[PDB]
Amino acid sequence: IVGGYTCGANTVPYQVSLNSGYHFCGGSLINSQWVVSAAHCYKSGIQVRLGEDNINVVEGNEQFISASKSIVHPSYNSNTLNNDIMLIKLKSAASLNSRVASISLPTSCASAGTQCLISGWGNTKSSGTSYPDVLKCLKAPILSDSSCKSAYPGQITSNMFCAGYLEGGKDSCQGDSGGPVVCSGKLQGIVSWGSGCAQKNKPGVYTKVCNYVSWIKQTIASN
Numbered sequence: 001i002v003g004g005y006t007c008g009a010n011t012v013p014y015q016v017s018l019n020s021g022y023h024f025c026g027g028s029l030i031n032s033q034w035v036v037s038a039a040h041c042y043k044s045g046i047q048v049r050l051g052e053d054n055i056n057v058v059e060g061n062e063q064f065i066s067a068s069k070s071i072v073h074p075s076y077n078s079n080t081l082n083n084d085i086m087l088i089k090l091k092s093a094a095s096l097n098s099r100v101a102s103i104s105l106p107t108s109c110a111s112a113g114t115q116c117l118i119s120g121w122g123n124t125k126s127s128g129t130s131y132p133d134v135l136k137c138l139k140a141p142i143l144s145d146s147s148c149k150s151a152y153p154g155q156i157t158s159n160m161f162c163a164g165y166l167e168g169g170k171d172s173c174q175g176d177s178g179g180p181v182v183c184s185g186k187l188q189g190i191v192s193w194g195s196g197c198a199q200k201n202k203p204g205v206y207t208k209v210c211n212y213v214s215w216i217k218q219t220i221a222s223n
């Protein structure tokens with residue numbers, strides 16, 4: 001996250017880190033046994049780390065659980081990033097508590113103007129590299145579809161939305177992928193892609209979660 005702030009330990013209780021020897025992607029806890037992430041985060045050998053703040057220090061609130069299966073969206077396109085969403089089933093159910101908690105799926109899509117919270121352990125520099133050990137947060141509004149499409153001509157589908165600031169300076173970045181955009185207590189977005197980080201007129205682009213609730217529900221019902 002660029003231009004954000006330090007969340008505070010365990011204040012974002014649905015945030016997970018995906019680890020394959022190191023943190024490589026974020027995700028969100030949707031129930032005691034299921035995580036949602038970006039399909040571009042797919043790989044084998046994923047351990048899901050919950051209850052994290054400092055990802056390099058065991059602080060006492062963590063649950064580390066192996067994934068038993070992952071399901072990439074049937075229509076994921078790796079070239080265009082259309083349908084950038086995947087589900088991961090944990091080997092065992094997490095123990096939910098004040099520091100580890102699920103986030104609710106949306107009943108409705110969120111509208112342009114809504115303020116949201118984006119979080120992750122990704123790079124914190126727009127040019128140059130510095131990866132935080134602790135969780136960073138950013139408040140950002142959802143941008144209009146028009147602003148989005150004009151920022152990225154020909155690249156925005158109905159399954160994507162832009163959030164951030166046209167002026168730049170604050171944005172998601174590398175390492176934040178898969179992570180949550182929460183608005184009014186509902187998971188509305190998944191960190192997906194961007195043209196660099198925090199550049200003017202190039203806001204981060206997010207998977208529109210409200211388009212997938214039926215797929216998610218259906219898939220968790222039979223897996």
Ligand SMILES: *[B]([O])([O])[C]([C]C1=[C]C(C#N)=[C][C]=[C]1)[N]C(=O)[C]1[C][C][C]N1C(=O)[C]([N])[C]C1=[C][C]=[C][C]=[C]1
Nearest residue numbers: 079080172173174175176177192193194195196204
């Ligand atoms: B995620 O992997 O950590 C990361 C998040 C992110 C990256 C950038 C940049 N630059 C800005 C905001 C968020 N996501 C990416 O690296 C995604 C996944 C693969 C490539 N990518 C992009 O952001 C690309 N820079 C742009 C892209 C757009 C359409 C098709 C392919 C790549």
Ligand SMILES: [Ca+2]
Nearest residue numbers: 022023055056
């Ligand atoms: Ca670690």
